[PDB]
Design a protein around this ligand. Structure first.
Ligand SMILES: O=c1ccn([C@@H]2O[C@H](COP(=O)(O)OP(=O)(O)O[C@H]3O[C@H](CO)[C@@H](O)[C@H](O)[C@H]3O)[C@@H](O)[C@H]2O)c(=O)[nH]1
Ligand SMILES: [Mn+2]
Ligand SMILES: [Mn+2]
Ligand SMILES: [Mn+2]
Length: 542
């Protein structure tokens, strides 16, 4: 897995009596100077490989029938290997910052209690919980608009309840058409106000809108902000509106897009986390992630063979929150399925244990490369609920560029679709066709997955965020890194190649209670589940 020499590569690509072409010589020279660079920075060493990989397929593009090509395709694979080598030999401990994000509303006690677990166990880490002091009223506003649409949709249902295909499917379809119109009425309002006075604060536009159009009480809203700001200050609150240099004005624009217009706090958070990791360095976590459990704790307790590796890891946590009681309310439903003598095997190991540090594994020194961003896995796929990156890392720029490039395709096609259409149905048809007209082999999948963007948060199985700002943008970045590209969208990296970038697994417990629920999306089950409730709030009332 060592990178071949000039002379060694020459053996590989040797064709008897063939002229040494300029494009070939160029490759060999450049490979020579890479091996005479060993003092340089990792990033600089990566960039030299990237030029070497560009000179190589220039050769291949030039001589498509050259008897050198086979060997040179293999060379390209060794370049890929060399990246992993540079990565694996450039590890260094991350900045000891620990990031969380809660925006668009008041932080709940459930999040703070999960966060506090991290704080207690990591003295040497600066816990920062980013919030947006200008935007406490996003969730409120969406809750009101969604509310109004639900109701209107249900009034056009008051004599069709029992059948036929007025099921939960038709409810969302038709609710969405109303949500879109109402949402657009607000956006148009917000946008005209910002033209008026650019200094205007998001929440101030929001309250004026809520009081004028939906009869909300000004005072109640100002007290909600005041409380929300109070709570988060009390809890290591870092206001983003206080920071100066961080702002990538492009990212800020898209951060604002997801926060104010789309009301996707998860998307907004996807955007803010990578920006903060880049500027600050460290470890990012979702507020529903708990720390890793100490290896040796339950090592002497053998997993009952009829029980999954997953449920056991899940029990391991519930066992902690039964006896030690760090989080009040934490489920033990799975723990109670166990045999008495095994339940007492857990009481036994949790007996002679003093500090929370002997229970949860502290993060300590986490080693990472400048060339990478480490990421959590769930079900043999990356998931960005947990990230690690050095300040100003190369791969963070790749991630940020993936986001921008994807939003450029989105916005360039969506914005005019918004302007040309006269309702939800027409906008979606214009958007769908515009993406069709510019779709090809290398982006078709991406186009399909972002087609339903305007539906995010309002309808079941809507997953566009994943491929704009979430996991997809990381696997995209990893393909950029390994394959030497800047445009990766058609993914060909398999799990074991993606596993190079994994969050160290012993240093996180992903399988918590709060993770079971999602706040930006929902599946078909929950959709049906709460169609019943909304409907059942029409016979049951005051
Ligand atoms: O009102 C909200 C709601 C969510 N969030 C943020 O959203 C993040 C994740 O929310 P979660 O409820 O866990 O949604 P998931 O269904 O788990 O979202 C998945 O998909 C998203 C990718 O778009 C990622 O943000 C998440 O890491 C990933 O777990 C949280 O940590 C918060 O930072 C807010 O700030 N305010
Ligand atoms: Mn009063
Ligand atoms: Mn810093
Ligand atoms: Mn989650």
């Amino acid at each position: 897995m060592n990178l071949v020499n000039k002379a060694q590569l020459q053996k590989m690509a040797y064709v008897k009596f063939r002229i040494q072409e300029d494009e070939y010589v160029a490759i060999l020279n450049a490979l020579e100077e890479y091996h005479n660079m060993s003092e340089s920075s990792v990033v600089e060493k990566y960039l030299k490989l990237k030029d070497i990989n560009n000179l190589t397929d220039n050769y291949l593009n030039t001589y498509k029938k050259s008897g050198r090509n086979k060997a040179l395709k293999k060379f390209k694979e060794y370049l890929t290997m060399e990246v992993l080598e540079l990565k694996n030999n450039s590890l260094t401990p991350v900045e000891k910052n620990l990031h969380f994000i809660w925006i668009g509303g008041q932080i709940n006690d459930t999040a703070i209690n999960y966060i506090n677990q991290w704080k207690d166990v990591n003295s040497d880490y600066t816990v920062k919980v980013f919030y947006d002091s200008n935007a406490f009223l996003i969730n409120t506003l969406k809750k009101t608009i969604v509310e109004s649409a639900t109701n209107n949709t249900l009034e056009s249902f008051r004599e069709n309840l029992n059948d036929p295909e007025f099921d939960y499917n038709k409810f969302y379809r038709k609710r969405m058409e109303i949500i879109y119109d109402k949402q657009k009425h607000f956006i148009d309002y917000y946008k005209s106000q910002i033209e008026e006075n650019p200094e205007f604060i998001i929440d101030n536009i929001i309250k004026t809108y809520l009081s004028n159009e939906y009869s909300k009480d000004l005072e109640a809203l100002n007290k909600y902000i005041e409380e929300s700001l109070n709570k988060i200050t009390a809890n290591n609150g870092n206001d983003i509106r206080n920071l100066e240099k961080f702002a990538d004005e492009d990212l800020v624009r898209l951060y604002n897009q997801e926060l104010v217009e789309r009301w996707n706090l998860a998307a907004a958070s996807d955007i803010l986390r990578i920006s903060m990791l880049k500027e600050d360095g460290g470890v990012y976590l979702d507020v529903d992630m708990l720390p890793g459990i100490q290896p040796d704790l339950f090592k002497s307790i053998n997993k009952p063979d009829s029980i999954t590796n997953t449920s056991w890891e899940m029990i391991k946590l519930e066992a902690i929150m039964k006896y030690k009681e760090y989080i009040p309310g934490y489920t033990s439903k799975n723990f109670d399925m166990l045999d008495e003598e095994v339940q007492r095997s857990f009481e036994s190991a949790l007996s002679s244990k003093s500090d929370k540090s002997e229970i949860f594994l502290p993060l300590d020194d986490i080693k990472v490369s400048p060339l990478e961003v480490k990421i959590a896995f769930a079900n043999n796929s990356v998931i960005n609920q947990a990230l690690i990156s050095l300040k100003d890392s190369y791969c963070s720029d790749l991630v940020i560029n993936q986001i921008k490039n994807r939003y450029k395709i989105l916005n360039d096609n969506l914005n005019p679709s918004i302007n040309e259409g006269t309702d939800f149905n027409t906008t979606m048809k214009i958007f769908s066709d515009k993406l069709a007209s510019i779709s090809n082999e290398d982006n078709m999948m991406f186009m399909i997955k972002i087609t339903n963007y305007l539906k995010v948060g309002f309808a079941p199985d809507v997953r566009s965020t994943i491929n704009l700002s979430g996991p997809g943008v990381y696997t995209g970045a990893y393909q950029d890194l390994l394959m030497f590209k800047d445009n990766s969208t058609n993914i060909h990296l398999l799990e074991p190649e993606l596993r190079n970038f994994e969050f160290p697994k012993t240093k996180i417990s992903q399988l918590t209670e709060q993770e079971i629920t999602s706040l930006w999306s929902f599946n078909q089950a929950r959709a049906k589940s709460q169609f019943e409730e909304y409907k059942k709030g029409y016979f049951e009332g005051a």
